[PDB]
Amino acid sequence: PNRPELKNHIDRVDAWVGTYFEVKIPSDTFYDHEDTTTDKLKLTLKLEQQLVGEKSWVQFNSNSQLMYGLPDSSHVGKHEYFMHATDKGGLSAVDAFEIHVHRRPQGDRAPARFKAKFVGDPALVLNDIHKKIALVKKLAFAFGDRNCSTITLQNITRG
């Protein structure tokens, strides 16, 4: 074993309804004595040690230590999650952090409404959070705004 230690809490992730967010875990978050920085450790995102599900609007890639997601109208408010860091001694350390989902940055006073029709059925998007995350990222890329979240999803319907 060694206990892995917490120096700097992930602290606050600010997110908006309909808008993709991305937070890469800093290296000075966890600091072990025998295993050093936050990078080598195994990180797992948890809610009573209840793993994030496949349909969760928040996701975590353990390989890249990248937390990302896309919240809807039902997620507004403050959310507390727990980041577990397990060392090569098998011990764990936990960082409780907050994701605060705000309302859509412009709400309904937006100056323009963009609509686009594609081929398929809205269920293939409204079921898979990742397919919907790709859609929103590619919409930003269509305006030259790749990985910027200049796009806020307003609705997905069938036509």
């Binding site: 309909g18 808008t19 859509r104 940055p105 412009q106 309904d108 006073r109 937006a110 100056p111 323009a112 409404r113 963009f114 609509k115 686009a116 029709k117 594609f118 081929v119 398929g120 059925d121 809205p122 293939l124 998007v125 397919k131 790709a134 859609l135 929103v136 590619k138 919409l139 890329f141 269509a142 305006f143 030259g144 200049t150 796009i151 806020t152 999803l153 307003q154 609705n155 997905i156 319907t157 069938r158 036509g159």
Partner: protein, 67 residues
Amino acid sequence: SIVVEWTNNTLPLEPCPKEQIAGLSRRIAEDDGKPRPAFSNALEPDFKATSITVTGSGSCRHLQFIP
């Protein structure tokens, strides 16, 4: 068919930025509904765009930009 609606949250709210919205509109669509290659190629291969519509709202509630 999948109708997706979104807003560009970089646009100023008031006064009506009709000239800015127009530029953004013609960058992704032609005079009619046809998506331009920048938009088709960005959404491909996962999504194939057929028609784009840009209507005004809020301070621009009276205007329409792409037919």
